[PDB]
C-alpha cells in the first residue's frame, strides 16, 4: 500500500503499509482515504513496526493518532535514539520484551563474525599541501580521489578473489567511484541507474559465482536493495550518523563460507585519510566501534604492496589523476542529500 | 504466570544465607559438585598389543553443535590427544583409522603406529563434510578382511565413533554377531549423546563395552577408560614370536664415510621414500632404514625395541592402592613422605604396605605419572628375596 | 631529539662508569662486597660460564681454545659475549705465555671472588661488624609501609604534594638532576621533563644513579665506599644491628645514611642511630629487571578490553597519582575507572616522549596479579594502537649538521665523501645534487682539511 | 663551499612537503627552509624547532578539525 501499489484495496486480509507521514492538503485523495478507511477495516490488526528509531516524535504523534490499534510490534534494533531523554518509548508501545545477545548469535549461531577495519593509509603529499592551502570543499575531494586509497582498493579485490567469496565496496560519491569502475572495471551502480539492469546486476552478483565483486552508491543501500554478501569495503565516512552507517554493514554481511574454524569470516573495511577529517572522524568512529565492541583492527600497510601489479605505481600517473582533480568541481563531492 | 515463573527459577538460587556471608555456600556446592569417578581398576588377564580400529560416523548429526561448533570438533581434536596418549601408554599396538562417509567406509589410515601419519590424517579430517548416512556393515567388512589376515595371536578390538543415528546398512549385521564372535574380534562403540539398542545389543553380544557421550569431560573419561588394554575374552593366545631385536647403526663404525647416504635403492632396508645415512638395523632382512620401533615389510617381523614398548605395560599392571584418612598421626613434622608439605584437607594418603603419608599432589603424581609408590622402594628391595 | 639513555642503562652502569674511569679506580671496585655486583648486572649466559673456569684456572688458558669453545652456531653471540667481558677490564690478555696470547682474568678479583665462592671469614664475611639480630624490637611489614610511603613522599612531591616532604637537600639535587627544577623566587619543586619520565619508570635504580651522581657534585668521599654500601644494602632485610653500622662505620657511611632514611631505604631511630635497617627494596635494585617479586602491592587483574582502560580496585593515591598524569577527564567513583582517550593519554606522553615499554611495564604493573589467568597477548591490537599513537606525534628527528652544497667538482666530492667516511662525521650524502650531511662537531676537521688540500 | 648550520629533520614525505606550507604560513619569511634534499631531509634555521616540536601537531590537528 505505498507508491501507487494499490494492491488489493477491496478486501483487506493481511496488509503491508507505510507510515503515512503526510499531513498534507489532499495528498492522496482516495488512496490515503483508503489508507484511512481500511485502517478502520483493519480494526486493530497488528502494528508491525520496523526500527522506530527512524520514527520522529512528531511521527510518533501519528503513530497513536492515526493508528489506534490494540497490539503493537516494535522491530527496532536501536535501544536509545535521537538524544531525546524527555519522551521515552514504553508509553508508545508498552514493554520492550526481548533483545538477543550478539555472543549467542555470533559465536553460537548463524551470524558471522565481522572483522571491522578502519584502514588509514599514508597518502601522497601532493594531495595535502593543496588541501591545507584551500579551505574550500574541493579539499574534501582531494583525499577522496587518492591512488593511495586505490592501492588499498586494488589490493583486497585480488586478495579476496583468492578465497572466491563475495565482496562489496561502498564509496561516497559517483565520479570518483566511477573511475574505480573505469580503472579496474567492476559491477557498479549510481543514482539514476535503471532498476531492471540493477536487478540483473543482483543476478550477476548474488547468483553468478564468476564475479564476486560489485560497487554500490548512496542509493543502493538505502532505496533499492538489501545486498547479501560476505566482505564489505567502505570509503564514505563524513557524516555523524553512526548507526545508520553501522546498520548498513549489519544488514549486508552474511556468512562467508561453511567455515569449520571459529574465526571471523564476515569482513568490514574502511578507507581513512590520514591527517584529515577522515582521520578525525574515524577516531570518534572507532570510538563508536568500541562503544558497541566488535572484532576491530586498524591496519595501515598491505600484505605486500608491490606483490600485486599496482596501478598508479608511478606518481606521474597519479599526476594524471591529479590534473583531473584539478579539473574537478564540487559536483563530484556531494551525496544524495 | 510465566514472567513470574521464569524468575521463580532464579530467585531462590540467587538467595542464600543472608545477613553476613552471602554468595558463599553457593561456591561450596560447586566444590561439592566436583569429585567424579576415580579409577575403579584392579584387573588381570588380558590386554596386550591391541589392533585398534577407529571407525568414524560421518553423518548429518555432526551439524548439531551440542558441545562444540561441530561434533567432529568435539571428536577429532581429542582423538589426536587420544592417539598421543595411546602411543604414550601402548606402543605395542597399532590403530586402523577407518572413516564411514556417505553409506560406505574408507579405511583412511592403515593399521599402523606412526603418529604423525595418523595425526595429519586427523588434520586432514578437519574439513570433512560428513555427507550421507552411517554404514557399519562396510566398516565391519574392512574390519573383517583386514584382521582376517592378522594372526590369532593378535588382540582384536574395534573402536567405533558413532553419532547415535540410524545404523543405515543392509546385509544382516545381526548375523555379523556369529561372524565376529567366531572371528574373536571385539567391537567397542560409544554413542554420541544417545543410544542405539541394536548397537547396544551388538556390544553386549560382543564383550566390547558400550557407552553414551555425556559431556566433553565425560568424553575424555571413556577415552581414558579405553586407553588401557582391556581384559578381553579368554582363549585368544599366549605367545608371539620372532620379536626382532634391532641394532642402532652409527654409520661410522669401521669405514668412516664410505657411503654418502645409506639409502640408494639397493641397501638392505631403505624402505620409505626419503634419503638416509644409516641409523638402524633389523636382524632378519638386516634392514637399515629410518628408525622405527614397530615392524617391517620384508623381514615382516616385529621390530621390537624393548626399553620403550616392552617397558610400557611392563609396569602398568602390577599396581596397588593407597588409603585415605582424615586423622592426624602427624608423620614427619606434619609433612609428606613425598613432596614434604601440608595443607590438611583431611586426605592423609597412606600406603597399603609401606604406609607412607602423601597428599593429593603426591597421590595424583603416583596415580597418573609415577604409577607406583616409591615408599615401597627402600621397603621392598632391602629384604627382597 | 629527546634523551632515551636516562631510563635504563643497566649494564653500562657497571661499564660506562667503570670504563669511564681508571683501572686503579675500578681496582677499588674489587672490594669483596663488590664481587656479587659484577656477576649479576651483566646478564650473558655465555660469559657467565667463561668465569666459571677461572676459580679452577690459575693458568692463562690459550685464547683459541675458548675462541673455539663454541663452533658455527652463534659465533656472533660468542663474540658479543666476549669483548664486553673484556670491556669490563677484568681480563688480562697475556702476550706469549707458551707461544701465543692466552687470556686470563685479573687475579685480585679472583682473590675477591673466591672468598665469595668458598670459605673466608673475612671482613665482609665476619670478624669486624657485619650484621646483628639481637631481639626483635621492630618488624618488617610495618617497615614495608615505610618502604612504601617514602616512595610516595618521593613520588608525590615530585608531582607536588598538598602535604609536604621532609627537610632534604635532595630536592636541590633533584632540581639539579633535571628531573625537577625550581625558578628562583620561593624555589618551586616542579618537574622539568625527566622526573615525569621517572614517574613513568618504577625501579630504584634511577635513585641509585643520582646516588651514584651524589658524589659527582663536587663531593669528595668514598665512591668506593657507597657502591660497596650499595651492595651492602642488597642483603634482603631482617637485621637491626647492635648499632652494627656504627661498629662498621665510616664518614660518608653514616652521613649519607641520614639520607637513606630520606631515601627511606634505611630506617633510623632516635639520634639517627643505635641500629640499622635494610628494606626488602634491597633486591630490585640488584637487578633493575622487572621481577615477579617486584609487585609492590597486589591489587588484582586488569584488562584493556575495547581499549577503554577497563579496571577497578580502589588503590592508594599514588596509583591515582600514577594515572592523574595518565587518565583524567571522565574519571569515575570508587573503583578507579577513568575512561580512555586516544589523544589525551597520547598528549600525556608529549612531556615524556614515548613510554613504549613503560606502557607495557605499567600494563603489567597497573593491577599486578593480571598475568595469573589472562592471555599472553594482553593487548591484542592495543599495543600497536599505543605504538601508532606514539608513532603519530613523533614527526621530527632533531639533528643539527653541516651541509656541503655547490661543490666545485664531482670526483673530489667523492674524495671528501671518502674523507668524511674515513672520519665518520658524515650522516648522509646526496651525490645526485653533490650534498653531504656532515656533523658540525666534525666540521672543523674537514674545514681544516679543505683549507689545506 | 657554503657552511650550512641548519638542522636536519627526517620524516615522511607526507610531512616533508608540509613544512613548505609551514614556511609559506610562517609568520616571518623563510627560515624553516634552508634547502631540502629530495623527499625525507630538510634544513631549518634553529630558532623555534623546540617550539615546532609542538607547534606542528597543534596546527595539523586543528586544520583537519575543520
Ligand atoms: Zn628379514
Ligand atoms: Zn603428598
Ligand atoms: Zn610405598
From Swiss-Prot, chain A:
Residues 151-311 form the Helicase C-terminal domain. ATP binds at residues 251, 254. The gene is ERCC3. Keywords: ATP-binding, Cockayne syndrome, Deafness, Disease variant, DNA damage, DNA repair, DNA-binding, Dwarfism, Helicase, Host-virus interaction, Hydrolase, Ichthyosis, Isomerase, Nucleotide-binding, Nucleus, Phosphoprotein, Transcription, Transcription regulation, Xeroderma pigmentosum. ATP-dependent 3'-5' DNA helicase/translocase. Binds dsDNA rather than ssDNA, unzipping it in a translocase rather than classical helicase activity. Component of the general transcription and DNA repair factor IIH (TFIIH) core complex. When complexed to CDK-activating kinase (CAK), involved in RNA transcription by RNA polymerase II. The ATPase activity of XPB/ERCC3, but not its helicase activity, is required for DNA opening; it may wrap around the damaged DNA wedging it open, causing localized melting that allows XPD/ERCC2 helicase to anchor. It is found in: Nucleus. GO terms for cellular component: nucleoplasm; nucleotide-excision repair factor 3 complex; nucleus; transcription factor TFIID complex; transcription factor TFIIH core complex; transcription factor TFIIH holo complex; transcription preinitiation complex. This is General transcription and DNA repair factor IIH helicase/translocase subunit XPB.
UniProtKB/Swiss-Prot annotation, chain B:
Residues 51-227 form the VWFA domain. GO terms for molecular function: RNA polymerase II general transcription initiation factor activity; zinc ion binding. The keyword DNA repair applies. It is found in: Nucleus. GO terms for cellular component: core TFIIH complex portion of holo TFIIH complex; nuclear speck; nucleoplasm; nucleus; transcription factor TFIID complex; transcription factor TFIIH core complex; transcription factor TFIIH holo complex. Gene3D superfamilies: von Willebrand factor, type A domain (3.40.50.410), Zinc/RING finger domain, C3HC4 (zinc finger) (3.30.40.10). The keyword Isomerase does not apply. Changing residue 367 to A: No effect on the transcriptional activity of the reconstituted TFIIH complex. Changing residue 336 to A: No effect on the transcriptional activity of the reconstituted TFIIH complex. This is General transcription factor IIH subunit 2.
Swiss-Prot record, chain C:
It holds the Pfam family Tfb2. It is found in: Nucleus. One of its GO terms (molecular function) is ATPase activator activity. InterPro entries: Tfb2_C (IPR040662), TFIIH_p52/Tfb2 (IPR004598). PANTHER family: GENERAL TRANSCRIPTION FACTOR IIH SUBUNIT 4, TFIIH, POLYPEPTIDE 4. The C-terminus (residues 305-462) stimulates the ATPase activity of XPB/ERCC3. GO terms for cellular component: core TFIIH complex portion of holo TFIIH complex; nuclear speck; nucleoplasm; nucleus; transcription factor TFIID complex; transcription factor TFIIH core complex; transcription factor TFIIH holo complex. Gene3D superfamilies: 3.30.70.2610. This is General transcription factor IIH subunit 4. The lineage of its organism: Eukaryota, Metazoa, Chordata, Craniata, Vertebrata. NCBIfam families: tfb2. Component of the 7-subunit TFIIH core complex composed of XPB/ERCC3, XPD/ERCC2, GTF2H1, GTF2H2, GTF2H3, GTF2H4 and GTF2H5, which is active in NER. The core complex associates with the 3-subunit CDK-activating kinase (CAK) module composed of CCNH/cyclin H, CDK7 and MNAT1 to form the 10-subunit holoenzyme (holo-TFIIH) active in transcription. It comes from Homo sapiens (Human). GO terms for biological process: DNA repair; nucleotide-excision repair; transcription by RNA polymerase II. Transmembrane segments: none annotated. Belongs to the TFB2 family. It comes from the Eukaryota. Keywords: DNA damage, DNA repair, Nucleus, Transcription, Transcription regulation.
Swiss-Prot record, chain D:
Keywords: Cytoplasm, Disease variant, DNA damage, DNA repair, Ichthyosis, Nucleus, Phosphoprotein, Transcription, Transcription regulation. The keyword DNA damage applies. The keyword Oxidoreductase does not apply. GO terms for biological process: cellular response to gamma radiation; maturation of SSU-rRNA from tricistronic rRNA transcript (SSU-rRNA, 5.8S rRNA, LSU-rRNA); nucleotide-excision repair; nucleotide-excision repair, preincision complex assembly; transcription by RNA polymerase II; transcription elongation by RNA polymerase I; transcription initiation at RNA polymerase II promoter. SMART domains: Tbf5 (SM01395). It is found in: Nucleus; Cytoplasm. InterPro entries: TFB5-like_sf, TFIIH_TTDA/Tfb5. One of its GO terms (cellular component) is transcription factor TFIIH holo complex. It holds the Pfam family Tfb5. Belongs to the TFB5 family. PANTHER family: GENERAL TRANSCRIPTION FACTOR IIH SUBUNIT 5. It is linked to Trichothiodystrophy 3, photosensitive: A form of trichothiodystrophy, an autosomal recessive disease characterized by sulfur-deficient brittle hair and multisystem variable abnormalities. The spectrum of clinical features varies from mild disease with only hair involvement to severe disease with cutaneous, neurologic and profound developmental defects. Ichthyosis, intellectual and developmental disabilities, decreased fertility, abnormal characteristics at birth, ocular abnormalities, short stature, and infections are common manifestations. This is General transcription factor IIH subunit 5.
Amino acid at each position: 500500500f505505498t507508491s501507487d501499489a494499490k494492491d488489493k484495496p477491496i478486501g483487506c486480509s493481511v496488509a503491508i503499509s507505510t507510515y503515512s507521514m503526510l499531513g498534507h492538503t489532499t495528498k492522496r485523495s482516495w488512496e490515503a482515504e483508503r489508507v484511512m478507511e481500511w485502517l478502520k477495516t483493519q480494526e486493530w490488526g497488528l502494528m508491525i513496526l520496523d526500527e522506530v528509531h527512524t520514527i520522529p516524535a512528531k511521527m510518533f504523534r501519528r503513530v497513536l493518532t492515526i493508528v489506534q490499534a490494540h497490539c503493537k510490534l516494535g522491530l527496532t534494533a536501536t535501544l536509545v535514539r535521537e538524544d531525546d531523554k524527555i519522551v521515552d518509548l514504553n508509553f508508545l508501545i508498552g514493554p520492550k520484551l526481548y533483545e538477543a545477545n550478539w555472543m549467542e548469535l555470533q559465536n553460537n549461531g548463524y551470524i558471522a563474525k565481522v572483522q571491522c577495519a578502519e584502514v588509514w593509509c599514508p597518502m601522497s603529499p601532493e594531495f595535502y599541501r593543496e588541501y591545507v592551502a584551500i579551505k574550500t570543499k574541493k579539499r574534501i575531494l582531494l583525499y577522496t580521489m587518492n591512488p593511495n586509497k586505490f592501492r588499498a582498493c586494488q589490493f583486497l579485490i585480488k586478495f579476496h578473489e583468492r578465497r572466491n567469496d563475495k565482496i562489496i565496496v561502498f564509496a561516497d560519491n559517483v565520479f570518483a567511484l566511477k573511475e574505480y569502475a573505469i580503472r579496474l572495471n567492476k559491477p557498479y551502480i549510481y543514482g539514476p541507474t535503471s532498476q531492471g539492469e540493477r536487478m540483473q546486476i543482483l543476478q550477476n552478483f548474488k547468483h553468478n559465482p564468476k564475479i564476486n565483486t560489485i560497487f554500490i552508491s548512496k542509493v543502493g543501500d538505502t532505496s533499492f536493495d538489501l545486498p547479501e554478501a560476505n566482505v564489505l569495503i567502505q570509503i564514505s565516512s563524513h557524516g555523524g550518523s553512526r548507526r545508520q552507517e553501522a546498520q548498513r554493514l549489519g544488514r549486508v554481511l552474511r556468512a562467508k563460507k561453511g567455515m569449520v574454524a571459529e574465526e571471523y569470516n564476515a569482513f568490514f573495511y574502511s578507507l581513512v585519510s590520514q591527517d584529515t577529517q577522515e582521520m578525525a572522524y574515524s577516531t570518534k568512529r572507532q570510538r563508536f566501534l568500541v562503544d558497541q565492541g566488535y572484532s576491530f583492527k586498524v591496519i595501515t600497510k598491505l600484505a605486500g604492496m608491490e606483490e600485486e601489479d599496482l596501478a598508479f605505481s608511478t606518481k606521474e600517473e597519479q599526476q594524471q589523476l591529479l590534473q583531473k582533480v584539478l579539473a574537478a568541481t564540487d559536483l563530484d563531492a556531494e551525496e544524495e542529500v | 504466570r510465566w514472567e513470574g515463573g521464569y524468575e521463580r527459577t532464579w530467585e531462590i538460587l540467587k538467595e542464600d544465607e543472608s545477613g553476613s556471608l552471602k554468595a558463599t555456600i553457593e561456591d561450596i556446592l560447586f566444590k561439592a559438585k566436583r569429585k567424579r569417578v576415580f579409577e575403579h581398576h584392579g584387573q588381570v588377564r588380558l590386554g596386550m598389543m591391541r589392533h585398534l580400529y577407529v571407525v568414524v560416523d560421518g553423518s548429518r548429526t555432526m551439524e548439531d553443535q551440542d558441545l562444540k561448533p561441530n561434533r567432529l570438533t568435539c571428536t577429532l581434536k581429542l582423538l589426536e590427544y587420544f592417539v598421543e596418549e595411546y602411543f604414550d601408554q601402548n606402543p605395542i599396538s597399532q590403530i586402523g583409522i577407518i572413516v564411514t562417509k556417505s553409506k560406505r567406509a574408507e579405511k583412511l589410515t592403515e593399521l599402523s603406529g606412526n603418529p604423525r601419519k595418523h595425526i595429519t590424517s586427523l588434520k586432514k579430517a578437519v574439513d570433512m563434510t560428513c555427507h550421507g548416512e552411517p554404514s557399519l556393515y562396510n566398516s565391519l567388512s574392512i574390519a573383517m578382511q583386514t584382521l582376517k589376515h592378522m594372526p590369532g595371536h593378535t588382540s582384536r578390538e574395534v573402536l567405533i565413533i558413532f553419532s547415535s543415528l540410524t545404523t543405515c546398512d543392509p546385509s544382516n549385521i545381526y548375523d555379523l554377531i556369529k561372524t565376529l564372535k567366531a572371528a574373536k574380534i571385539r567391537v567397542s562403540v560409544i554413542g554420541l549423546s544417545a543410544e542405539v539398542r541394536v548397537c547396544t545389543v551388538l556390544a553386549r553380544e560382543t564383550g566390547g563395552t558400550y557407552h553414551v557421550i555425556l559431556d566433553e569431560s565425560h568424553y575424555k573419561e571413556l577415552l581414558t577408560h579405553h586407553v588401557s588394554p582391556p581384559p578381553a575374552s579368554s582363549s585368544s593366545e599366549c605367545s608371539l614370536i620372532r620379536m626382532g631385536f634391532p641394532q642402532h647403526t652409527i654409520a661410522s663404525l669401521s669405514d668412516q664415510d664410505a657411503k654418502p647416504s645409506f639409502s640408494m635403492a639397493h641397501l638392505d632396508g631403505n624402505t620409505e621414500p626419503g634419503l638416509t645415512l644409516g641409523g638402524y638395523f633389523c636382524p632378519q632382512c638386516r634392514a637399515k632404514y629410518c628408525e622405527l620401533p614397530v615392524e617391517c615389510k620384508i623381514c615382516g617381523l616385529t621390530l621390537v625395541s624393548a626399553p620403550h614398548l616392552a617397558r610400557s605395560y611392563h609396569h602398568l599392571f602390577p599396581l596397588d592402592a593407597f588409603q585415605e584418612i582424615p586423622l592426624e598421626e602427624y608423620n614427619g613434622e606434619r609433612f609428606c613422605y613425598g613432596c614434604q608439605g601440608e595443607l590438611k584437607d583431611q586426605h592423609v594418603y597412606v600406603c597399603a604396605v609401606c604406609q607412607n603419608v602423601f597428599c593429593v599432589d603426591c597421590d595424583v603424581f603416583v596415580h597418573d605419572s609415577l604409577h607406583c609408590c616409591p615408599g615401597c622402594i627402600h621397603k621392598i628391595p632391602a629384604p627382597s628375596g | 631529539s629527546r634523551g632515551l639513555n636516562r631510563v635504563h642503562l643497566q649494564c653500562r652502569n657497571l661499564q660506562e662508569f667503570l670504563g669511564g674511569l681508571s683501572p686503579g679506580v675500578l681496582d677499588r671496585l674489587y672490594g669483596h662486597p663488590a664481587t656479587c655486583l659484577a656477576v649479576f648486572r651483566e646478564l650473558p649466559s655465555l660469559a657467565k660460564n667463561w668465569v666459571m673456569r677461572m676459580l679452577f684456572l690459575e693458568q692463562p688458558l690459550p685464547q683459541a681454545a675458548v675462541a673455539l669453545w663454541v663452533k658455527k652456531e652463534f659465533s656472533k653471540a660468542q663474540e658479543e659475549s666476549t669483548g664486553l667481558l673484556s670491556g669490563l677490564r677484568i681480563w688480562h690478555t697475556q702476550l706469549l705465555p707458551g707461544g701465543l696470547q692466552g687470556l686470563i682474568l685479573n687475579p685480585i678479583f679472583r682473590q675477591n671472588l673466591r672468598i665469595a665462592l668458598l670459605g673466608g671469614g673475612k671482613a665482609w664475611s665476619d670478624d669486624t661488624s657485619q650484621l646483628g639480630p639481637d631481639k626483635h624490637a621492630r618488624d618488617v611489614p610495618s617497615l614495608d609501609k615505610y618502604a612504601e610511603e617514602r616512595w610516595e613522599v618521593v613520588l608525590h612531591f615530585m608531582v607536588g604534594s598538598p602535604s609536604a616532604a621532609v627537610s632534604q637537600d635532595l630536592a636541590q639535587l633533584l632540581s639539579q638532576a633535571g628531573l625537577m627544577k625550581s625558578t628562583e623566587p620561593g624555589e618551586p619543586p616542579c618537574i622539568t621533563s625527566a622526573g615525569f619520565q621517572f614517574l613513568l619508570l618504577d625501579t630504584p635504580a634511577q635513585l641509585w644513579y643520582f646516588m651514584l651522581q651524589y658524589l659527582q657534585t663536587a663531593q669528595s668521599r668514598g665512591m668506593d665506599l657507597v657502591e660497596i654500601l650499595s651492595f651492602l644494602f642488597q642483603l634482603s632485610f631482617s637485621t637491626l644491628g647492635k648499632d652494627y653500622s656504627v661498629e662498621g662505620m665510616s664518614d660518608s657511611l653514616l652521613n649519607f645514611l641520614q639520607h637513606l632514611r630520606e631515601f627511606g631505604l634505611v630506617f633510623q631511630r632516635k639520634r639517627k642511630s643505635r641500629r640499622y635497617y635494610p628494606t626488602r627494596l634491597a633486591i630490585n635494585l640488584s637487578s633493575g629487571v622487572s621481577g615477579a617479586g617486584g609487585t609492590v602491592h597486589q591489587p588484582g587483574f586488569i584488562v584493556v578490553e575495547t581499549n577503554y582502560r577497563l579496571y577497578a580496585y580502589t588503590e592508594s593515591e599514588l596509583q591515582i597519582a600514577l594515572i592523574a598524569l595518565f587518565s583524567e577527564m571522565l574519571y569515575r567513583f570508587p573503583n578507579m575507572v577513568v575512561a580512555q582517550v586516544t589523544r589525551e593519554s597520547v598528549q600525556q606522553a608529549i612531556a615524556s616522549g614515548i613510554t613504549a615499554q613503560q606502557i607495557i611495564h605499567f600494563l603489567r604493573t597497573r593491577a599486578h596479579p593480571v598475568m595469573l589467568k589472562q592471555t599472553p597477548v594482553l593487548p591484542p591490537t592495543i599495543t600497536d594502537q599505543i605504538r601508532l599513537w606514539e608513532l603519530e606525534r613523533d614527526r621530527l628527528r632533531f639533528t643539527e649538521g653541516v651541509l656541503y652544497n655547490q661543490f666545485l667538482s664531482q670526483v673530489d666530492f667523492e674524495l671528501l665523501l671518502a674523507h668524511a667516511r674515513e672520519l665518520g662525521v658524515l650522516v648522509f650524502e646526496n651525490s645526485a645534487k653533490r650534498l653531504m650531511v656532515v656533523t658540525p662537531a666534525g666540521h672543523s676537521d674537514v674545514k681544516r682539511f679543505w683549507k689545506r688540500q | 663551499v657554503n657552511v650550512l648550520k641548519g638542522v636536519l629533520i627526517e620524516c615522511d614525505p607526507a610531512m616533508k612537503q608540509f613544512l613548505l606550507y609551514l614556511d609559506e604560513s610562517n609568520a616571518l619569511g623563510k627560515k624553516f627552509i634552508i634547502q631540502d634534499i629530495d623527499d625525507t631531509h630538510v634544513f631549518v634555521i634553529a630558532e623555534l624547532v623546540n617550539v615546532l616540536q609542538e607547534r606542528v601537531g597543534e596546527l595539523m590537528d586543528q586544520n583537519a578539525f575543520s
